[PDB]
Amino acid sequence: LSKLRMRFFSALNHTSEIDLQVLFNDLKSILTLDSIEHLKEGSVAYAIIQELLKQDDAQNKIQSFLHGAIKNVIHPGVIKGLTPDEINWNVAKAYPKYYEHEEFPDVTFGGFKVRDSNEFKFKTNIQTSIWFSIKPDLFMPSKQQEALKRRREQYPGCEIRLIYSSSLLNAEANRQMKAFARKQNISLIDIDSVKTDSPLYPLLKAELAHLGKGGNPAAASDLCRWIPELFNEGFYVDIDLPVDSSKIVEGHQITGGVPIMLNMGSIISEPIAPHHRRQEAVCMNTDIIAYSNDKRTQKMMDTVARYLKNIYDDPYTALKDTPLAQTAFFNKCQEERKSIFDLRKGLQDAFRSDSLLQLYDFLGADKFKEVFKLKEAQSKYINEHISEFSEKDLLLNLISDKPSEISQHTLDFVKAKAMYIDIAKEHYSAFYKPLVEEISGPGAIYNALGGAGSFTTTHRRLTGPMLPTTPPRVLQVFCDAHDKGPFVSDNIARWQTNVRDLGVLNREGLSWLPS
Ligand SMILES: O=c1ccn([C@@H]2O[C@H](COP(=O)(O)OP(=O)(O)O)[C@@H](O)[C@H]2O)c(=O)[nH]1
Ligand SMILES: OC[C@H]1O[C@@H](O)[C@H](O)[C@@H](O)[C@@H]1O
Numbered sequence: 001l002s003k004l005r006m007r008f009f010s011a012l013n014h015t016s017e018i019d020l021q022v023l024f025n026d027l028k029s030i031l032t033l034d035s036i037e038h039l040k041e042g043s044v045a046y047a048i049i050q051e052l053l054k055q056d057d058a059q060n061k062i063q064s065f066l067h068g069a070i071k072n073v074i075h076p077g078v079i080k081g082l083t084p085d086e087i088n089w090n091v092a093k094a095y096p097k098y099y100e101h102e103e104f105p106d107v108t109f110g111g112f113k114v115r116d117s118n119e120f121k122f123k124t125n126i127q128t129s130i131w132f133s134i135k136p137d138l139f140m141p142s143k144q145q146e147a148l149k150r151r152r153e154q155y156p157g158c159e160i161r162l163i164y165s166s167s168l169l170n171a172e173a174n175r176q177m178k179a180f181a182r183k184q185n186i187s188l189i190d191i192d193s194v195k196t197d198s199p200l201y202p203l204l205k206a207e208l209a210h211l212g213k214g215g216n217p218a219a220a221s222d223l224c225r226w227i228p229e230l231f232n233e234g235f236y237v238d239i240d241l242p243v244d245s246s247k248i249v250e251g252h253q254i255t256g257g258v259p260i261m262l263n264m265g266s267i268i269s270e271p272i273a274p275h276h277r278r279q280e281a282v283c284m285n286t287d288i289i290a291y292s293n294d295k296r297t298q299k300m301m302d303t304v305a306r307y308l309k310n311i312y313d314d315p316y317t318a319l320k321d322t323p324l325a326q327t328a329f330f331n332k333c334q335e336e337r338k339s340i341f342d343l344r345k346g347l348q349d350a351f352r353s354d355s356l357l358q359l360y361d362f363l364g365a366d367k368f369k370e371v372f373k374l375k376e377a378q379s380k381y382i383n384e385h386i387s388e389f390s391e392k393d394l395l396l397n398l399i400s401d402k403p404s405e406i407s408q409h410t411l412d413f414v415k416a417k418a419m420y421i422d423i424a425k426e427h428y429s430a431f432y433k434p435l436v437e438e439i440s441g442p443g444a445i446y447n448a449l450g451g452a453g454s455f456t457t458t459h460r461r462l463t464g465p466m467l468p469t470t471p472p473r474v475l476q477v478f479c480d481a482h483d484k485g486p487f488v489s490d491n492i493a494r495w496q497t498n499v500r501d502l503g504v505l506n507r508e509g510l511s512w513l514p515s
């Protein structure tokens with residue numbers, strides 16, 4: 001009985017406003033150590049009990065409350081793999097007069113109205129990762145190999161699947177991949193051989209075929225995540241994500257309110273005048289995705305795939321608000337209907353050119369003026385004469401708005417050029433990253449899922465136990481694969497991060513940005 005009794009008394013705060021021993025005696029039949037966690041302070045049950053304590057007939061009312069709550073809500077919840085938050089909502093919903101609350105709101109996520117029924121089930125012990133190599137002689141770098149060996153030990157008995165492309169590897173590298181998979185007991189999937197009707201399949205093959213000419217392996221990996229033949233159960237996880245073994249659950253099953261969950265969090269803004277309202281914006285990432293065994297997973301997946309397909313048919317709209325949209329190069333590509341690959345390749349080429357003239361032609365008058373912080377007169381002059389400039393003409397007009405005043409006989413032109421090229425190159429990654437993120441990645445996915453702004457919301461202070469009564473709370477409780485799954489990611493903010501506390505994200509990430 002014995003320390004269960006002692007846990008029970010502690011959970012109920014050793015109150016003598018009722019007799020706990022007598023209560024325990026009538027509950028000893030259904031009480032378990034697991035259900036006690038859901039009775040402690042911070043729980044809905046606890047709060048309900050504190051209110052019953054202040055009314056007549058507390059002994060009896062509490063006993064019937066507890067017996068029903070445990071038998072019908074908490075115990076079945078624990079066995080299903082429900083979280084403490086999901087259990088709390090189920091108790092409040094089952095006892096609406098003991099615990100008054102707002103309605104569960106209508107929230108659309110990927111075309112699905114989010115449900116509070118816990119009906120979607122997910123396996124946490126099946127995990128799929130992706131590695132497409134850009135070096136034909138290296139099947140996978142050591143970092144990622146060691147991540148995989150480590151995952152085997154932090155999550156024993158998990159099924160690891162690995163997607164790769166044999167066409168990217170030479171004979172020997174391919175043999176080494178297969179040998180690595182044999183040694184690690186990994187299920188190896190060759191994307192080259194996958195049979196699918198997905199519209200994403202030729203796009204991912206094109207990304208891989210364009211490596212070295214504007215393709216990107218993270219983009220190909222992004223696309224794989226939304227093909228039903230590859231993902232219909234378990235989790236997708238970025239290959240080097242660690243497992244927090246304390247987050248592993250007994251049955252290796254969790255539930256959600258939608259058929260596909262992923263990594264979510266949120267940022268709360270500072271209070272804005274005049275009403276001091278703070279705003280909560282939900283963040284999302286695709287480094288952790290959980291797919292339900294339910295067949296409705298295929299419908300959500302096809303909604304996303306169609307959105308992605310539309311983006312590849314016309315990337316210029318998806319990119320309209322990114323930094324690259326401000327450049328003459330971007331406008332030129334758009335007018336010429338260049339592919340996303342020609343767009344990425346032109347950017348990379350501009351930045352290895354070493355030419356200030358080529359840089360100007362790439363950026364265009366306005367972006368050039370802002371990059372180099374030029375005065376209006378200096379910018380107008382350049383724009384008006386650049387059609388007859390040498391590299392030296394341009395460099396002199398960058399150094400001074402009175403090129404004549406400059407003692408060229410003391411100037412180091414090589415150093416000066418390098419300096420200006422350098423300033424421009426600090427912009428490369430802000431130009432490039434969106435060419436993946438807004439195309440196949442989390443920016444495109446966030447839009448495909450209704451996102452975002454549909455969930456943006458205005459923020460309210462929590463008073464008691466958290467409940468899914470506002471859109472962000474519905475997402476947190478029912479649609480987030482991060483907190484309830486076994487993996488941990490530093491890519492985006494965790495839930496309800498005050499903006500001042502954001503910190504640096506993805507400290508050691510970004511393997512996919514070409515040098
Ligand atoms: O050379 C590469 C680089 C990246 N990736 C894929 O792209 C994913 C994301 O890479 P990373 O975690 O570095 O991106 P981040 O999460 O830091 O934005 C990896 O998990 C792989 O699936 C790949 O296949 N080959
Ligand atoms: O889309 C490019 C990358 O974006 C990152 O934020 C995700 O963590 C990666 O999984 C993804 O490949």
Ligand SMILES: [Mn+2]
Pocket residue numbers: 238287491509510
């Ligand atoms: Mn990552």
